Amino acid sequence: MNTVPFTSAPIEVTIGIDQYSFNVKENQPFHGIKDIPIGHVHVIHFQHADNSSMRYGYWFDCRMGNFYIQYDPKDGLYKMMEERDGAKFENIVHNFKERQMMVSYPKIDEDDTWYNLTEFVQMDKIRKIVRKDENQFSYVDSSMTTVQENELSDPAHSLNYTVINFKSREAIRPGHEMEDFLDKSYYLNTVMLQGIFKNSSNYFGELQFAFLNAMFFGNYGSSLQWHAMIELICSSATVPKHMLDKLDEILYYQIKTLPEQYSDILLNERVWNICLYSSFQKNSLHNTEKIMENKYPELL
Protein backbone atom coordinates (compact mmCIF):
# COMPACT_ATOMS: atom_id res chain seq x y z
CA MET A 1 0.00 0.00 0.00
CA ASN A 2 1.35 3.50 -0.93
CA THR A 3 1.29 6.90 0.79
CA VAL A 4 0.92 10.52 -0.37
CA PRO A 5 2.28 12.69 2.46
CA PHE A 6 1.29 16.36 2.85
CA THR A 7 3.90 18.94 4.00
CA SER A 8 0.98 20.74 5.78
CA ALA A 9 -2.61 22.02 5.38
CA PRO A 10 -2.32 25.83 5.70
CA ILE A 11 -5.80 26.52 4.22
CA GLU A 12 -9.19 24.95 5.00
CA VAL A 13 -10.05 22.51 2.18
CA THR A 14 -12.24 19.52 1.28
CA ILE A 15 -9.79 16.76 0.11
CA GLY A 16 -11.00 13.93 -2.14
CA ILE A 17 -9.10 10.68 -2.75
CA ASP A 18 -10.96 8.78 -5.50
CA GLN A 19 -14.63 8.51 -4.40
CA TYR A 20 -13.80 9.48 -0.72
CA SER A 21 -13.65 12.99 0.79
CA PHE A 22 -12.50 14.54 4.15
CA ASN A 23 -12.68 18.15 5.50
CA VAL A 24 -9.37 19.63 6.72
CA LYS A 25 -9.43 22.81 8.91
CA GLU A 26 -6.99 25.77 8.38
CA ASN A 27 -3.59 24.66 9.93
CA GLN A 28 -5.12 21.30 11.11
CA PRO A 29 -2.18 18.89 11.68
CA PHE A 30 -2.83 16.79 8.54
CA HIS A 31 0.14 14.98 6.86
CA GLY A 32 -1.58 12.95 4.13
CA ILE A 33 -3.17 9.70 2.97
CA LYS A 34 -1.81 6.18 3.59
CA ASP A 35 -2.87 2.61 2.57
CA ILE A 36 -3.59 3.70 -1.07
CA PRO A 37 -4.21 0.53 -3.12
CA ILE A 38 -1.42 -0.32 -5.57
CA GLY A 39 -2.54 -1.37 -9.07
CA HIS A 40 -4.99 1.43 -9.95
CA VAL A 41 -4.69 5.07 -10.98
CA HIS A 42 -5.93 7.44 -8.29
CA VAL A 43 -7.07 11.06 -8.11
CA ILE A 44 -6.48 13.40 -5.16
CA HIS A 45 -8.69 16.50 -5.44
CA PHE A 46 -9.32 19.77 -3.66
CA GLN A 47 -12.10 22.34 -3.07
CA HIS A 48 -11.05 25.33 -0.95
CA ALA A 49 -13.60 26.20 1.84
CA ASP A 50 -13.21 29.93 0.91
CA ASN A 51 -13.70 29.49 -2.93
CA SER A 52 -15.87 26.41 -3.81
CA SER A 53 -15.05 27.53 -7.41
CA MET A 54 -12.09 25.69 -9.04
CA ARG A 55 -12.25 22.07 -7.92
CA TYR A 56 -8.78 20.78 -9.01
CA GLY A 57 -6.66 17.70 -8.55
CA TYR A 58 -4.01 15.21 -9.67
CA TRP A 59 -4.20 11.85 -11.41
CA PHE A 60 -1.29 9.64 -10.31
CA ASP A 61 -0.11 6.02 -9.99
CA CYS A 62 2.15 5.33 -6.92
CA ARG A 63 4.04 2.71 -9.00
CA MET A 64 5.56 5.55 -11.10
CA GLY A 65 7.27 7.46 -8.22
CA ASN A 66 7.03 8.97 -4.69
CA PHE A 67 4.45 11.81 -4.70
CA TYR A 68 3.59 14.35 -2.02
CA ILE A 69 1.33 17.44 -1.66
CA GLN A 70 2.61 20.82 -0.55
CA TYR A 71 0.63 24.06 -0.47
CA ASP A 72 2.15 26.89 -2.59
CA PRO A 73 1.19 30.23 -0.94
CA LYS A 74 2.14 32.10 -4.17
CA ASP A 75 -0.08 30.10 -6.61
CA GLY A 76 -2.65 29.48 -3.83
CA LEU A 77 -3.06 25.78 -4.32
CA TYR A 78 -2.11 22.34 -3.12
CA LYS A 79 0.52 21.09 -5.60
CA MET A 80 1.59 17.52 -6.27
CA MET A 81 5.37 17.06 -6.38
CA GLU A 82 7.73 14.09 -6.91
CA GLU A 83 10.42 13.35 -4.26
CA ARG A 84 13.44 11.81 -6.14
CA ASP A 85 15.31 10.95 -2.84
CA GLY A 86 13.81 7.54 -1.87
CA ALA A 87 15.28 7.65 1.69
CA LYS A 88 14.15 11.24 2.50
CA PHE A 89 10.64 10.10 1.36
CA GLU A 90 10.58 6.78 3.34
CA ASN A 91 11.81 8.82 6.38
CA ILE A 92 9.08 11.50 5.97
CA VAL A 93 6.30 8.85 5.63
CA HIS A 94 7.51 6.63 8.55
CA ASN A 95 7.53 9.72 10.93
CA PHE A 96 3.99 10.87 9.87
CA LYS A 97 2.58 7.31 10.21
CA GLU A 98 4.16 6.90 13.73
CA ARG A 99 2.58 10.23 14.81
CA GLN A 100 -0.72 8.98 13.09
CA MET A 101 -1.11 12.32 11.27
CA MET A 102 -2.43 10.51 8.10
CA VAL A 103 -5.92 9.39 7.01
CA SER A 104 -6.29 5.83 5.73
CA TYR A 105 -7.66 5.14 2.22
CA PRO A 106 -10.90 3.74 3.61
CA LYS A 107 -11.52 0.82 1.21
CA ILE A 108 -14.32 -1.64 2.23
CA ASP A 109 -12.92 -5.17 1.45
CA GLU A 110 -16.14 -6.26 -0.49
CA ASP A 111 -16.17 -2.98 -2.49
CA ASP A 112 -14.87 -3.03 -6.13
CA THR A 113 -16.24 0.46 -6.99
CA TRP A 114 -12.89 2.12 -7.76
CA TYR A 115 -11.64 -0.84 -9.84
CA ASN A 116 -15.05 -0.83 -11.69
CA LEU A 117 -14.71 2.96 -12.44
CA THR A 118 -11.02 2.80 -13.50
CA GLU A 119 -10.79 -0.73 -15.08
CA PHE A 120 -9.42 0.51 -18.47
CA VAL A 121 -7.87 3.81 -17.26
CA GLN A 122 -4.06 3.88 -17.64
CA MET A 123 -1.71 6.66 -16.40
CA ASP A 124 0.15 6.49 -19.79
CA LYS A 125 -3.15 7.38 -21.63
CA ILE A 126 -4.03 10.11 -19.05
CA ARG A 127 -0.63 11.77 -19.79
CA LYS A 128 -1.53 11.98 -23.55
CA ILE A 129 -4.92 13.59 -22.78
CA VAL A 130 -3.33 15.95 -20.16
CA ARG A 131 0.00 17.14 -21.65
CA LYS A 132 2.75 18.05 -19.11
CA ASP A 133 5.51 15.52 -19.83
CA GLU A 134 7.96 16.87 -17.14
CA ASN A 135 5.60 15.40 -14.41
CA GLN A 136 4.45 11.75 -13.91
CA PHE A 137 1.09 12.97 -12.52
CA SER A 138 -1.64 15.00 -14.30
CA TYR A 139 -3.41 18.17 -13.12
CA VAL A 140 -7.10 18.64 -14.05
CA ASP A 141 -9.58 21.32 -12.90
CA SER A 142 -13.20 22.51 -13.36
CA SER A 143 -12.42 25.19 -16.01
CA MET A 144 -10.04 23.27 -18.36
CA THR A 145 -11.43 23.17 -21.91
CA THR A 146 -11.17 20.33 -24.43
CA VAL A 147 -9.34 20.54 -27.83
CA GLN A 148 -12.88 20.09 -29.39
CA GLU A 149 -14.30 23.00 -27.26
CA ASN A 150 -11.18 25.13 -28.29
CA GLU A 151 -12.10 24.58 -32.05
CA LEU A 152 -15.70 25.96 -31.55
CA SER A 153 -7.96 28.84 -25.85
CA ASP A 154 -4.48 28.03 -24.26
CA PRO A 155 -3.38 24.68 -25.85
CA ALA A 156 -0.91 23.73 -23.00
CA HIS A 157 -3.84 23.67 -20.44
CA SER A 158 -6.33 21.71 -22.65
CA LEU A 159 -7.95 18.23 -22.35
CA ASN A 160 -6.78 16.44 -25.55
CA TYR A 161 -9.77 14.02 -25.72
CA THR A 162 -10.25 12.22 -29.06
CA VAL A 163 -12.48 14.54 -31.21
CA ILE A 164 -15.84 12.85 -32.02
CA ASN A 165 -18.18 14.78 -34.36
CA PHE A 166 -21.21 12.97 -35.94
CA LYS A 167 -21.45 15.63 -38.74
CA SER A 168 -17.81 15.51 -39.86
CA ARG A 169 -16.08 14.09 -42.97
CA GLU A 170 -14.31 11.74 -40.47
CA ALA A 171 -17.71 10.28 -39.42
CA ILE A 172 -19.28 10.18 -42.94
CA ARG A 173 -18.01 8.27 -46.01
CA PRO A 174 -18.83 10.01 -49.34
CA GLY A 175 -21.76 8.08 -50.91
CA HIS A 176 -22.82 6.57 -47.51
CA GLU A 177 -24.24 9.82 -46.01
CA MET A 178 -27.60 8.47 -44.77
CA GLU A 179 -26.12 5.02 -43.97
CA ASP A 180 -23.18 6.37 -41.90
CA PHE A 181 -25.30 9.07 -40.14
CA LEU A 182 -28.13 6.72 -39.06
CA ASP A 183 -25.84 3.67 -38.29
CA LYS A 184 -22.46 4.84 -36.92
CA SER A 185 -20.78 1.35 -37.02
CA TYR A 186 -18.23 2.50 -39.69
CA TYR A 187 -17.19 5.48 -37.50
CA LEU A 188 -17.04 3.36 -34.27
CA ASN A 189 -15.39 0.17 -35.63
CA THR A 190 -13.12 1.36 -38.57
CA VAL A 191 -12.30 5.06 -37.77
CA MET A 192 -12.28 5.02 -33.96
CA LEU A 193 -11.59 1.43 -32.76
CA GLN A 194 -9.27 0.12 -35.55
CA GLY A 195 -7.89 3.56 -36.58
CA ILE A 196 -7.39 5.81 -33.50
CA PHE A 197 -7.89 3.85 -30.22
CA LYS A 198 -6.50 0.50 -31.68
CA ASN A 199 -8.75 -1.55 -29.24
CA SER A 200 -11.91 -1.25 -27.06
CA SER A 201 -9.79 -1.10 -23.81
CA ASN A 202 -8.25 2.31 -24.83
CA TYR A 203 -11.74 3.56 -25.92
CA PHE A 204 -13.28 2.51 -22.56
CA GLY A 205 -10.23 4.05 -20.77
CA GLU A 206 -10.94 7.49 -22.31
CA LEU A 207 -14.72 7.12 -21.70
CA GLN A 208 -14.03 6.28 -17.99
CA PHE A 209 -11.49 9.12 -17.59
CA ALA A 210 -13.95 11.61 -19.16
CA PHE A 211 -16.73 10.52 -16.73
CA LEU A 212 -14.45 10.83 -13.68
CA ASN A 213 -13.26 14.36 -14.71
CA ALA A 214 -16.95 15.30 -15.20
CA MET A 215 -17.93 13.87 -11.76
CA PHE A 216 -14.95 14.99 -9.64
CA PHE A 217 -14.34 18.45 -11.19
CA GLY A 218 -17.73 19.29 -12.85
CA ASN A 219 -15.59 19.61 -16.03
CA TYR A 220 -18.20 20.38 -18.74
CA GLY A 221 -16.04 19.34 -21.75
CA SER A 222 -15.36 15.99 -20.04
CA SER A 223 -19.12 15.45 -19.64
CA LEU A 224 -19.65 16.18 -23.41
CA GLN A 225 -16.87 13.65 -24.20
CA TRP A 226 -18.34 10.89 -21.95
CA HIS A 227 -21.80 11.31 -23.58
CA ALA A 228 -20.33 11.42 -27.14
CA MET A 229 -18.44 8.13 -26.56
CA ILE A 230 -21.67 6.48 -25.19
CA GLU A 231 -23.79 7.82 -28.04
CA LEU A 232 -21.31 6.61 -30.72
CA ILE A 233 -21.66 3.00 -29.40
CA CYS A 234 -25.47 3.23 -28.85
CA SER A 235 -25.93 4.66 -32.44
CA SER A 236 -23.92 1.76 -34.03
CA ALA A 237 -25.99 -1.30 -35.21
CA THR A 238 -22.80 -3.47 -35.28
CA VAL A 239 -20.79 -3.59 -32.01
CA PRO A 240 -18.84 -6.61 -30.70
CA LYS A 241 -20.98 -8.46 -28.04
CA HIS A 242 -18.06 -8.22 -25.50
CA MET A 243 -18.02 -4.40 -25.90
CA LEU A 244 -21.79 -4.07 -25.27
CA ASP A 245 -21.59 -6.29 -22.18
CA LYS A 246 -18.57 -4.32 -20.86
CA LEU A 247 -20.26 -0.95 -21.66
CA ASP A 248 -23.33 -2.04 -19.63
CA GLU A 249 -21.03 -2.78 -16.59
CA ILE A 250 -19.05 0.49 -17.04
CA LEU A 251 -22.18 2.69 -17.20
CA TYR A 252 -23.89 0.77 -14.35
CA TYR A 253 -20.98 1.66 -11.94
CA GLN A 254 -20.85 5.30 -13.23
CA ILE A 255 -24.62 5.78 -12.66
CA LYS A 256 -24.32 4.00 -9.29
CA THR A 257 -21.54 6.33 -8.08
CA LEU A 258 -22.99 9.67 -9.40
CA PRO A 259 -24.27 11.91 -6.53
CA GLU A 260 -28.13 11.70 -6.56
CA GLN A 261 -28.30 15.56 -6.55
CA TYR A 262 -26.01 16.09 -9.68
CA SER A 263 -28.04 13.97 -12.22
CA ASP A 264 -29.64 17.33 -13.35
CA ILE A 265 -26.28 18.82 -14.63
CA LEU A 266 -24.18 15.61 -15.34
CA LEU A 267 -26.72 13.54 -17.36
CA ASN A 268 -27.85 14.58 -20.90
CA GLU A 269 -31.62 13.68 -21.16
CA ARG A 270 -31.43 13.40 -25.01
CA VAL A 271 -28.43 11.01 -25.07
CA TRP A 272 -29.77 8.70 -22.31
CA ASN A 273 -33.37 8.58 -23.67
CA ILE A 274 -31.94 7.90 -27.18
CA CYS A 275 -29.41 5.27 -25.89
CA LEU A 276 -31.88 3.34 -23.64
CA TYR A 277 -35.14 3.58 -25.68
CA SER A 278 -34.57 4.52 -29.44
CA SER A 279 -30.97 3.41 -30.33
CA PHE A 280 -29.78 0.11 -31.89
CA GLN A 281 -28.52 -0.83 -28.39
CA LYS A 282 -31.85 0.03 -26.54
CA ASN A 283 -32.11 -3.68 -25.44
CA SER A 284 -28.35 -4.31 -24.87
CA LEU A 285 -27.80 -2.29 -21.60
CA HIS A 286 -30.02 -4.21 -19.10
CA ASN A 287 -28.00 -3.28 -15.97
CA THR A 288 -27.72 0.41 -16.96
CA GLU A 289 -31.42 0.69 -17.98
CA LYS A 290 -32.46 -0.89 -14.60
CA ILE A 291 -30.29 1.39 -12.40
CA MET A 292 -31.26 4.49 -14.50
CA GLU A 293 -35.04 3.68 -14.30
CA ASN A 294 -34.84 3.09 -10.50
CA LYS A 295 -32.49 6.02 -9.63
CA TYR A 296 -33.32 8.81 -12.23
CA PRO A 297 -36.82 8.01 -13.67
CA GLU A 298 -37.47 11.83 -13.84
CA LEU A 299 -34.59 12.32 -16.35
CA LEU A 300 -36.29 9.72 -18.65
Binding site: K167, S168, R169, I172, E177, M178, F181, L182
Partner: protein, 237 residues
Protein backbone atom coordinates in the same frame (compact mmCIF):
# COMPACT_ATOMS: atom_id res chain seq x y z
CA UNK B 1 -29.94 31.10 -37.88
CA UNK B 2 -33.68 30.86 -38.81
CA UNK B 3 -35.31 32.93 -41.60
CA UNK B 4 -38.42 34.89 -40.36
CA UNK B 5 -40.60 38.04 -40.95
CA UNK B 6 -37.82 40.11 -39.18
CA UNK B 7 -35.01 39.15 -41.71
CA UNK B 8 -37.31 38.92 -44.81
CA UNK B 9 -35.49 41.40 -47.17
CA UNK B 10 -32.38 39.12 -47.00
CA UNK B 11 -34.10 36.86 -49.63
CA UNK B 12 -33.70 39.64 -52.26
CA UNK B 13 -30.09 40.75 -51.59
CA UNK B 14 -27.15 39.74 -53.89
CA UNK B 15 -26.03 36.65 -51.85
CA UNK B 16 -27.13 33.63 -53.94
CA UNK B 17 -29.57 31.50 -51.98
CA UNK B 18 -32.00 28.68 -52.61
CA UNK B 19 -35.13 27.56 -50.83
CA UNK B 20 -35.55 23.76 -50.77
CA UNK B 21 -39.03 22.27 -50.25
CA UNK B 22 -39.21 18.46 -49.96
CA UNK B 23 -43.01 18.19 -49.41
CA UNK B 24 -43.73 16.74 -52.92
CA UNK B 25 -40.69 14.35 -53.09
CA UNK B 26 -42.43 11.22 -51.76
CA UNK B 27 -46.05 11.06 -52.97
CA UNK B 28 -48.55 8.17 -52.65
CA UNK B 29 -52.15 7.19 -53.36
CA UNK B 30 -53.62 5.09 -50.50
CA UNK B 31 -55.93 2.25 -51.70
CA UNK B 32 -57.65 -1.01 -50.61
CA UNK B 33 -56.13 -4.43 -51.55
CA UNK B 34 -58.34 -7.35 -52.73
CA UNK B 35 -58.09 -8.80 -49.14
CA UNK B 36 -59.39 -5.41 -47.78
CA UNK B 37 -55.94 -4.33 -46.41
CA UNK B 38 -54.50 -0.87 -47.26
CA UNK B 39 -51.43 -0.29 -49.44
CA UNK B 40 -49.72 2.71 -51.01
CA UNK B 41 -48.79 3.27 -54.64
CA UNK B 42 -45.97 5.83 -55.11
CA UNK B 43 -46.45 8.43 -57.86
CA UNK B 44 -43.77 10.72 -59.31
CA UNK B 45 -42.65 13.59 -57.11
CA UNK B 46 -40.34 16.58 -57.24
CA UNK B 47 -37.85 18.68 -55.27
CA UNK B 48 -38.80 22.37 -55.31
CA UNK B 49 -35.50 24.29 -55.27
CA UNK B 50 -36.08 28.01 -55.89
CA UNK B 51 -33.81 31.07 -56.16
CA UNK B 52 -36.22 33.72 -54.74
CA UNK B 53 -34.15 36.56 -56.34
CA UNK B 54 -34.17 35.29 -60.02
CA UNK B 55 -37.21 32.99 -60.03
CA UNK B 56 -35.06 30.04 -61.21
CA UNK B 57 -36.79 26.84 -60.13
CA UNK B 58 -34.62 23.70 -60.34
CA UNK B 59 -37.42 21.12 -60.47
CA UNK B 60 -35.80 17.72 -59.85
CA UNK B 61 -38.37 15.10 -60.85
CA UNK B 62 -38.36 12.10 -58.50
CA UNK B 63 -39.39 9.06 -60.52
CA UNK B 64 -41.11 6.19 -58.59
CA UNK B 65 -38.19 3.90 -59.55
CA UNK B 66 -36.01 5.62 -56.83
CA UNK B 67 -38.25 3.98 -54.12
CA UNK B 68 -38.02 0.41 -55.57
CA UNK B 69 -36.89 -2.08 -52.86
CA UNK B 70 -36.30 0.73 -50.32
CA UNK B 71 -37.67 0.81 -46.71
CA UNK B 72 -38.65 3.82 -44.51
CA UNK B 73 -39.46 5.89 -47.64
CA UNK B 74 -40.51 9.11 -45.75
CA UNK B 75 -37.00 9.03 -44.11
CA UNK B 76 -35.22 8.13 -47.38
CA UNK B 77 -37.08 11.01 -49.15
CA UNK B 78 -35.28 13.56 -46.95
CA UNK B 79 -31.86 12.03 -47.72
CA UNK B 80 -32.62 11.69 -51.48
CA UNK B 81 -33.63 15.39 -51.41
CA UNK B 82 -30.32 16.30 -49.70
CA UNK B 83 -28.37 14.06 -52.17
CA UNK B 84 -30.00 15.80 -55.26
CA UNK B 85 -29.51 19.35 -53.83
CA UNK B 86 -25.83 18.50 -53.06
CA UNK B 87 -25.43 17.13 -56.64
CA UNK B 88 -27.05 20.34 -58.04
CA UNK B 89 -24.65 22.58 -56.04
CA UNK B 90 -21.61 20.47 -57.15
CA UNK B 91 -22.87 20.77 -60.80
CA UNK B 92 -22.82 24.63 -60.69
CA UNK B 93 -19.70 26.79 -61.19
CA UNK B 94 -18.30 28.20 -57.89
CA UNK B 95 -19.66 31.74 -58.64
CA UNK B 96 -23.22 30.29 -59.04
CA UNK B 97 -23.22 28.09 -55.90
CA UNK B 98 -25.54 29.38 -53.15
CA UNK B 99 -24.10 30.98 -49.96
CA UNK B 100 -27.22 29.75 -48.07
CA UNK B 101 -29.84 27.00 -48.52
CA UNK B 102 -33.09 27.57 -46.61
CA UNK B 103 -35.12 24.40 -45.96
CA UNK B 104 -38.87 24.80 -45.52
CA UNK B 105 -39.00 21.81 -43.06
CA UNK B 106 -36.57 21.41 -40.06
CA UNK B 107 -36.33 17.63 -40.75
CA UNK B 108 -34.24 18.49 -43.88
CA UNK B 109 -31.44 20.24 -41.81
CA UNK B 110 -29.34 17.19 -40.78
CA UNK B 111 -29.70 15.33 -44.13
CA UNK B 112 -28.62 18.47 -46.04
CA UNK B 113 -25.84 19.44 -43.54
CA UNK B 114 -24.37 15.91 -43.85
CA UNK B 115 -24.62 15.85 -47.72
CA UNK B 116 -22.98 19.35 -47.83
CA UNK B 117 -19.98 18.60 -45.52
CA UNK B 118 -17.73 19.33 -48.58
CA UNK B 119 -19.19 22.96 -48.52
CA UNK B 120 -18.50 24.23 -44.98
CA UNK B 121 -19.04 27.88 -46.19
CA UNK B 122 -22.68 27.17 -47.36
CA UNK B 123 -25.10 28.00 -44.47
CA UNK B 124 -28.02 25.54 -44.09
CA UNK B 125 -30.93 27.42 -42.44
CA UNK B 126 -34.47 26.64 -41.33
CA UNK B 127 -37.28 29.21 -41.57
CA UNK B 128 -40.14 30.36 -39.26
CA UNK B 129 -42.19 31.26 -42.42
CA UNK B 130 -45.11 28.92 -43.40
CA UNK B 131 -44.35 29.02 -47.15
CA UNK B 132 -46.95 27.46 -49.46
CA UNK B 133 -44.47 25.63 -51.79
CA UNK B 134 -46.36 22.32 -51.12
CA UNK B 135 -49.00 23.72 -53.62
CA UNK B 136 -46.35 23.65 -56.47
CA UNK B 137 -48.12 20.56 -57.91
CA UNK B 138 -51.28 22.74 -58.39
CA UNK B 139 -49.38 24.62 -61.17
CA UNK B 140 -50.61 22.69 -64.26
CA UNK B 141 -47.31 22.67 -66.22
CA UNK B 142 -45.18 21.56 -63.18
CA UNK B 143 -47.72 18.80 -62.39
CA UNK B 144 -47.72 17.72 -66.11
CA UNK B 145 -43.92 17.43 -66.41
CA UNK B 146 -43.69 15.43 -63.08
CA UNK B 147 -46.50 12.95 -63.97
CA UNK B 148 -45.25 12.39 -67.56
CA UNK B 149 -41.61 11.67 -66.50
CA UNK B 150 -40.51 8.06 -67.25
CA UNK B 151 -37.00 8.54 -65.69
CA UNK B 152 -35.22 11.00 -63.35
CA UNK B 153 -35.14 14.50 -64.96
CA UNK B 154 -34.29 18.06 -63.87
CA UNK B 155 -36.31 20.86 -65.56
CA UNK B 156 -35.32 24.55 -65.02
CA UNK B 157 -38.38 26.88 -64.89
CA UNK B 158 -38.67 30.58 -64.22
CA UNK B 159 -41.58 30.62 -61.73
CA UNK B 160 -41.81 34.44 -62.11
CA UNK B 161 -42.23 34.22 -65.96
CA UNK B 162 -41.20 37.71 -67.27
CA UNK B 163 -42.49 39.56 -64.14
CA UNK B 164 -38.93 40.78 -63.24
CA UNK B 165 -38.97 43.00 -66.41
CA UNK B 166 -41.68 45.06 -64.57
CA UNK B 167 -41.48 44.41 -60.75
CA UNK B 168 -38.77 43.75 -58.10
CA UNK B 169 -37.97 40.21 -56.77
CA UNK B 170 -39.59 41.22 -53.43
CA UNK B 171 -42.87 41.95 -55.27
CA UNK B 172 -42.57 38.84 -57.51
CA UNK B 173 -41.99 36.60 -54.45
CA UNK B 174 -45.04 38.21 -52.75
CA UNK B 175 -47.17 37.53 -55.88
CA UNK B 176 -45.89 33.92 -56.10
CA UNK B 177 -46.59 33.21 -52.36
CA UNK B 178 -50.12 34.73 -52.69
CA UNK B 179 -50.88 32.56 -55.79
CA UNK B 180 -49.56 29.41 -54.06
CA UNK B 181 -51.33 30.23 -50.73
CA UNK B 182 -54.59 30.57 -52.78
CA UNK B 183 -54.02 27.31 -54.71
CA UNK B 184 -53.22 25.53 -51.37
CA UNK B 185 -56.41 26.83 -49.60
CA UNK B 186 -58.91 26.26 -52.49
CA UNK B 187 -57.31 24.87 -55.67
CA UNK B 188 -60.60 24.89 -57.70
CA UNK B 189 -61.45 28.56 -56.81
CA UNK B 190 -57.79 29.66 -57.31
CA UNK B 191 -57.60 28.05 -60.82
CA UNK B 192 -61.09 29.45 -61.74
CA UNK B 193 -59.81 33.00 -60.89
CA UNK B 194 -56.62 32.51 -62.99
CA UNK B 195 -58.28 30.93 -66.12
CA UNK B 196 -61.77 32.66 -66.12
CA UNK B 197 -60.96 35.11 -69.04
CA UNK B 198 -59.91 32.98 -72.09
CA UNK B 199 -58.52 36.11 -73.92
CA UNK B 200 -55.57 36.08 -71.40
CA UNK B 201 -53.27 33.17 -72.35
CA UNK B 202 -50.18 31.45 -70.86
CA UNK B 203 -47.05 31.78 -73.04
CA UNK B 204 -45.51 28.39 -74.09
CA UNK B 205 -42.45 28.94 -71.71
CA UNK B 206 -44.51 30.61 -68.88
CA UNK B 207 -46.40 29.03 -65.96
CA UNK B 208 -48.93 31.85 -65.36
CA UNK B 209 -51.20 33.96 -67.61
CA UNK B 210 -49.91 37.13 -69.40
CA UNK B 211 -51.82 39.60 -67.14
CA UNK B 212 -51.33 43.36 -67.69
CA UNK B 213 -50.23 45.29 -64.52
CA UNK B 214 -53.91 46.31 -63.92
CA UNK B 215 -55.16 42.71 -64.42
CA UNK B 216 -52.55 41.46 -61.83
CA UNK B 217 -54.01 43.97 -59.28
CA UNK B 218 -57.54 42.49 -59.85
CA UNK B 219 -56.18 38.89 -59.83
CA UNK B 220 -54.18 39.60 -56.59
CA UNK B 221 -57.35 41.11 -54.95
CA UNK B 222 -59.47 38.07 -55.97
CA UNK B 223 -56.78 35.72 -54.47
CA UNK B 224 -56.81 37.63 -51.10
CA UNK B 225 -60.71 37.46 -51.01
CA UNK B 226 -60.50 33.63 -51.63
CA UNK B 227 -58.02 33.16 -48.74
CA UNK B 228 -60.06 35.25 -46.21
CA UNK B 229 -63.38 33.54 -47.28
CA UNK B 230 -61.94 29.97 -46.82
CA UNK B 231 -60.44 31.14 -43.45
CA UNK B 232 -63.89 32.24 -42.08
CA UNK B 233 -65.26 28.81 -43.22
CA UNK B 234 -62.30 26.75 -41.76
CA UNK B 235 -62.55 28.48 -38.32
CA UNK B 236 -66.24 29.69 -38.34
CA UNK B 237 -65.13 33.31 -37.48
Amino acid sequence: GAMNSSNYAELFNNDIKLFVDDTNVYRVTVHKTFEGNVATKAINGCIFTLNPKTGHLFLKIIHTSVWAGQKRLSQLAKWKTAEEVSALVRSLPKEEQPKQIIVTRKAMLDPLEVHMLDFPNIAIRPTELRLPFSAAMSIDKLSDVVMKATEPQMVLFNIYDDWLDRISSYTAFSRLTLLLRALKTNEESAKMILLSDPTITIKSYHLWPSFTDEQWITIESQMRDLILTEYGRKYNV
